[PDB]
């Protein structure tokens, strides 16, 4: 309980941040997956639009509907990154 | 090539086939589909997506079929008249 609210700031936190462009390679990873069996849902819903998605635009926009804070200013900048995440896969897919 | 090359295709593929059934992890990960996408610059599928280096394919086969049939005319031109010359000589003038 004390873990399922760290992917609860742990999947907001590393999603804001646009330091790290991947931010998907090791998402699948089984401790950290445990964990978001008992974390809400939507939030890893909309975890897999940036782990594969990408659009997916409901769930990139469900983010912003359960938790309000801290998203106002990387919302227009998570928009990019949908944007980009589809150029790579459209060809790879 | 072809050997050596696709027999590590078809060892690899079932054994990675194999990872959703059983032996997870290896997950792997990430490095075994990372280059595989580097090796699929090209697929190539079908059919071989070579519209753009089609023209191109025998554009490479241009001068290597071009030479070959200009070197062989006189190369021929060597071979074949000193060969007829060195052997009349020898031959008609000692009988």
Do not use: V
């Given at each position: 309980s004390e873990q399922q609210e760290r992917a609860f700031t742990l999947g907001l936190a590393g999603l804001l941040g646009e330091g790290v462009f991947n931010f998907g390679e090791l998402l699948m990873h089984p401790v950290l997956e445990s964990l978001r069996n008992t974390?809400?849902?939507w939030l890893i819903d909309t975890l897999y639009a940036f782990n594969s998605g990408n659009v997916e635009r409901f769930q990139t926009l469900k983010t912003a509907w359960g938790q309000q804070p801290?998203?106002?200013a990387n919302e227009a900048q998570l928009?990019?990154?949908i944007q980009l995440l589809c150029l790579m896969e459209m060809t790879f897919t | 090539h072809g050997l050596?090359?696709?027999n590590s295709k078809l060892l690899d593929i079932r054994s990675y086939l194999e990872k959703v059934a059983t032996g997870k992890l290896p997950i792997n990960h990430q490095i075994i589909y990372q280059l595989q996408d580097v090796f699929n610059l090209l697929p190539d599928v079908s059919?071989?997506?070579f519209v753009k280096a089609f023209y191109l394919k025998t554009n490479d086969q241009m001068v290597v079929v071009y030479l070959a049939s200009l070197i062989r005319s006189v190369v021929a031109?060597?071979?074949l008249i000193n060969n007829?010359?060195?052997?009349?000589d020898a031959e008609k003038k000692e009988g």
């Open positions: 974390d809400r849902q801290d998203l106002a928009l990019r990154k | 050596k090359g696709l059919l071989q997506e031109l060597h071979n007829k010359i060195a052997n009349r």
